[PDB]
Amino acid sequence: FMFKHIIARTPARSLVDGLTSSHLGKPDYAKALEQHNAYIRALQTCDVDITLLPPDERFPDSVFVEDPVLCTSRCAIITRPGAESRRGETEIIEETVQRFYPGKVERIEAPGTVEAGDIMMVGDHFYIGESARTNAEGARQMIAILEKHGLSGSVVRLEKVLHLKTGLAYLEHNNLLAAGEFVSKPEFQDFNIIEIPEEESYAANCIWVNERVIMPAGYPRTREKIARLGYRVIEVDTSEYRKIDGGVSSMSLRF
Numbered sequence: 001f002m003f004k005h006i007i008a009r010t011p012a013r014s015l016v017d018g019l020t021s022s023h024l025g026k027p028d029y030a031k032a033l034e035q036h037n038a039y040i041r042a043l044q045t046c047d048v049d050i051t052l053l054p055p056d057e058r059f060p061d062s063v064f065v066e067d068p069v070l071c072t073s074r075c076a077i078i079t080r081p082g083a084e085s086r087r088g089e090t091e092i093i094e095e096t097v098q099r100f101y102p103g104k105v106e107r108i109e110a111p112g113t114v115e116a117g118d119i120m121m122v123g124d125h126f127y128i129g130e131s132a133r134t135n136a137e138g139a140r141q142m143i144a145i146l147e148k149h150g151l152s153g154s155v156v157r158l159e160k161v162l163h164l165k166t167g168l169a170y171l172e173h174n175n176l177l178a179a180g181e182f183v184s185k186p187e188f189q190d191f192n193i194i195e196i197p198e199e200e201s202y203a204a205n206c207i208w209v210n211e212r213v214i215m216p217a218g219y220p221r222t223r224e225k226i227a228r229l230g231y232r233v234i235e236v237d238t239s240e241y242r243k244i245d246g247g248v249s250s251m252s253l254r255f
């Protein structure tokens with residue numbers, strides 16, 4: 001398989017006020033702009049076309065387009081963010097999704113809450129984390145939609161991270177990056193688990209795109225663990241997004 005498209009959104013000046021549970025300082029808007037540009041330039045080398053949406057000042061975290069939608073090979077499901085300040089992000093991305101998925105857009109409804117960063121796609125199976133942002137009802141609604149379309153899904157329990165993909169990344173070919181509490185999960189033991197060292201935990205969030213793997217710059221052990229598997233590794237500094245608990249998976253929709 002291969003992805004044909006990516007969707008992303010320019011960061012807003014209000015990014016400095018993005019939600020966070022970290023204490024790594026506040027994002028520097030000018031520097032964040034340069035990093036997002038570097039991220040797009042990396043994506044321009046991955047044989048995909050890119051749809052880059054304009055910034056929206058009303059939504060500080062709207063650069064993290066991964067959360068408001070789940071794009072699959074069969075349909076797109078608009079989610080329902082658990083974070084109060086981000087629920088409205090579904091509205092500003094709906095027109096784009098509708099253009100790519102005519103007559104194939106589904107949606108999560110109350111009382112469900114889902115943020116797609118909690119979803120990890122492995123073939124036609126979708127692992128969905130039960131977090132502070134994605135509740136069991138939301139997971140249920142999503143699994144039912146996936147099943148309606150011939151896909152499958154399951155719930156993964158978590159307690160220590162913001163979203164499932166904060167500490168996990170599937171790089172195709174059975175290669176799974178795992179950090180913290182996901183490393184010893186029974187559901188993931190038939191994968192080739194690549195345990196991320198503690199000092200480099202942030203680097204568990206990486207993206208496979210057409211045999212290239214885009215990862216945060218500054219995590220050398222992880223970079224070598226991926227490189228040796230045969231992937232073309234591209235390093236992009238995302239330090240300003242790390243400050244507001246986001247990374248490379250967070251910043252795009254890939255399908």
Ligand SMILES: NC(=O)NCCC[C@H](N)C(=O)O
Nearest residue numbers: 019061066117244245246250
């Ligand atoms: N899928 C993701 O990695 N989402 C990260 C969202 C970070 C944002 N500052 C938030 O707290 O919602």
